[PDB]
Design a protein around this nucleic acid. Sequence first.
RNA 1: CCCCGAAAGCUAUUUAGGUAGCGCCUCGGACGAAUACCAUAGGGGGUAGAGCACUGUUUCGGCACCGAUGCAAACUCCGAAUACCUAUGAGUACUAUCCGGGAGACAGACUGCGGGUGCUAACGUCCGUAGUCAAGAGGAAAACAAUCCAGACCGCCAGCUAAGGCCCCAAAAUCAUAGUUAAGUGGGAAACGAUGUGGGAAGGCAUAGACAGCUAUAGUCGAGUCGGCCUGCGCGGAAGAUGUAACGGG
Lengths: 97, 76, 142, 137, 38, 57
Amino acid sequence: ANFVLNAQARAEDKQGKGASRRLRRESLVPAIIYGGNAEPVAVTLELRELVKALESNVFFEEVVEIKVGDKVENVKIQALQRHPAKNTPMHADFKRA
Amino acid sequence: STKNGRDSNPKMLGVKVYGGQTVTAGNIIVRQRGTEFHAGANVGMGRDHTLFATADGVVKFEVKGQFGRRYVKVET
Amino acid sequence: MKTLSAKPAEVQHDWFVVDATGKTLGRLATEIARRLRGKHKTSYTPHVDTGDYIIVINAEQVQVTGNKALDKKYYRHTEFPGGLKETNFEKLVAHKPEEIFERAVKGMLPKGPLGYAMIKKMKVYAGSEHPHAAQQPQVLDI
Amino acid sequence: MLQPKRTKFRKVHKGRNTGLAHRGSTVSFGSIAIKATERGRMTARQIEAARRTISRRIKRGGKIFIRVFPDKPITEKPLEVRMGNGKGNVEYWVCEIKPGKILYEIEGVNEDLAREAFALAAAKLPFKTTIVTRTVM
Amino acid sequence: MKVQASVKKICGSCKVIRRNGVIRVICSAEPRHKQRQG
Amino acid sequence: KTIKVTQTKSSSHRLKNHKLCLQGLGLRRIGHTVEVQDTPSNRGMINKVYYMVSVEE
RNA sequence: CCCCGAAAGCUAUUUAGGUAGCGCCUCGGACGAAUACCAUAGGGGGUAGAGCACUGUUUCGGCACCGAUGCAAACUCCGAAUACCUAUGAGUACUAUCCGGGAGACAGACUGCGGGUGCUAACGUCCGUAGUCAAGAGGAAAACAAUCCAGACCGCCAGCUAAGGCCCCAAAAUCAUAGUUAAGUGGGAAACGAUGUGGGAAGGCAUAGACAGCUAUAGUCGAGUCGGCCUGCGCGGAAGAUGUAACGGG
Ligand SMILES: [Zn+2]
C-alpha cells in the first residue's frame, strides 16, 4: 500500500553475467522472489525507486507490493547485495508473505 | 652466503591408467606415497603401496565403505 | 606508353587575383597551393609545373582564430651561438605581411627545385593595388 | 607499532593484489567508519600516524576500532650490494588493501566530530577513501 | 602574496576570484591573506 | 542441410589447433569458400574459429 | 639452377665459448588410415576463487572456553574454467609407425599471459606458456629486427580489399546527422585546490512573499533561490643545459 515497486519480467535470455551487467549499465536491478507454495519468479526494478525505498527505515518491516503487468505480489525484503566500493545496490531477494 | 639450495630428484607419482581403459594382468594403475586409493576386486597392493591389476578387464573408480575411501577395481 | 606527360613548351599559365580580406590563413593557403601546383587541371603531371599565377591583395587583413594572434610564434636561427630570434603574428603582420603568406604556402609546397619554381608564381602585396595590370588578371573567389 | 608476536616463516613471496573486498566492507562495531576506495599497501607507521591523529581530534571521548593489521613482512637489500646472494632482510610490515576495506570505525562520538577527524586522517594515507555509516542491510 | 598549490579561504572577509585563468584569494580585512595559485 | 563457409582473415599467426580446424574444414586461403555437411562435428570446428570465417546457410 | 628445411633444449663431462647420447632437419626402403583436427561418452585432480573445520596469526566484548571480526607460498570443511588419458563416429588432410645413409645445433632476443628474484626499478635476471625475429621481403606506426596487417615462382601503364586513412606536403569526404571543448586541451606527468562549463537523481525555502543590498526581528524591494550527491570534458600543481624541439611539418 505505502510501498509499490514497478517491475518487468526477467526471461531466460536476460539471465547470466553479461545480461546482468547490461541491465546495470541500463540502470536497472535484477531481483528474485521466492517463498512458500509457489515457484520462484525473476524480475527487474529501477535503481532510483529501490534507492528511494531503502532510504526509509520502515521499509524493512512492512509488506510491499511488487507489480509486474497485471499481477501483483505481496512480499518482504529478505536480502540485498551492494557494490563493495560504491555501495550501489546490485541484487535483491523478496520472500512471499 | 645462503644455507638453502637443496632438493631431491623427482619421483613421478600419479595415476597411470584412468577409468574406462582396458588393462592386462600386471599393469600398474596408481603410483602413490600413501594409500590415497585402496585396492578393490582384482587389484593388488605392493610393498610401497602401488596398486596393480591381477586380471584382464576395465578399470573403475568409486567411493565406498563407511569411511568413504576411494577404491579402484578391475571388471572382467 | 599511352599515358602522356604534359610538355613544358605547351603549358599555359593564367593569372588570377585574390582578395584576402577576412579569410582564414590556412584555409586560403591550401587552395592557393593547389592552384600553384596545378592539381586542378587534367594535364597534371608530378614532374612538370602546370599551375597558375596568383596575386594576393589586402594581405594584412588575413585572420586567425582563437588566441593565435598573440600566441602563434615565428622562429629563426642565425647560425651564431645563442642566435634564436622570435616574433608573433600581430607584429609580423603589421611589419611584413608577405612573409606570413610565404611561410604558409612554402610549408604546403614540395621541397625541391620544382617547389622553388612553383613558389615564384605567387605575388603578395599589402595594399589594394598591384603592378600587374598588363597581365590582365581575372578575379578568383577562393 | 603493530607487528605479529610470532610468525611461522620470516620471509614471504611478493604475490599480486587483485580483486575487491567482499569481506570487511560492512560497519560492524561503531556507527561511522572510513573505507578505502582504491587498492594499495598500508604500513604500520601509517596506521599509527592515522590513529594518533584521530584520537587527538576526538579528544578520547569515544572508542576507535582499528580493523587493519600489518602481517606481511617486506625485505630490502642492504644497499651497494649486487644482485643475487639470497633474499634480503626484513625492514617493515604492511597490510594489503583492496577497494571496500574498512580501516577505522568510531563509536560514541558526534557525527560532525567524527567526519572532522576522518578528514584529518585521510591526508596521511596513500590511497583515496570515503565515509560510510551503519545501515540495516 | 602567498603563492601555493592549495589556496583556501581563511576567514570570512576572504573572497575567491578568477583573473585571466588564475585562481586568487583576496581579503578585505587582512592583506596577509592574499593568495595566488601557482 | 549444407553450409557455405568463407575464410576472411589470415591464419599464419594463429594457434595450432585453430589452423588444424581450418585445414580440417578444407579452407586454404583468404577468400576461399567451401561447402560442408551440416553436422555437429563440423559446427564444432566452425565455432572454434568463428572469428576468421563467415558462414552462410 | 631446382626440392625440402632446423636448433640455441634435456642428461653427463677438470665441464661451462669443446664433446657424446637423446630431442629437432634431410635422403632411401617397408607399410597404409594404425595419425591428427572436432563431436559425443567415460575418468583422476586440489590450482584460480573461497573459507576458518585443522595448523598458525589478528581485533573487540564475556567468563583455557563462549559471541561477533580479519589474514596465509610451505593452512584446507570446499572447489572451477582450461589442460591431460581412453573409446566410438562424420568430413577434410600424404598422416602416424618401423628399418637404414648424411647432418647441423647444444651464446638466443623481444612482446603478451602465470610467477620467483629486484624497488610491482632496468632494453635487469631465472622458469612455464603462445607469437614474431633468428632464417622473412611488402603496407601501417615520421625515422624504428622482436608491435599491427600479411607469407614475395616470373611478367602486365587491369580490378577488389586488410591494418591504417581521406585540408596541403601526399592517394582518397574542406561528406552527412546530433552533441562536447576554448585549454592549441587535442599534441608528456601525481596527491591536492577551485562559483569553468554540459547531463542526471534527490532535499530546503518561496508571490499570506524567498537570497543579497539597503533604512532602525520591521521596512522600501518583486522570482526564483539556497546547500550538498553522482557523472562528461576542461583549469592550476608543471624548472635545464648547442636551436623552435613533448602533432613529422604547414
Ligand atoms: Zn582573510
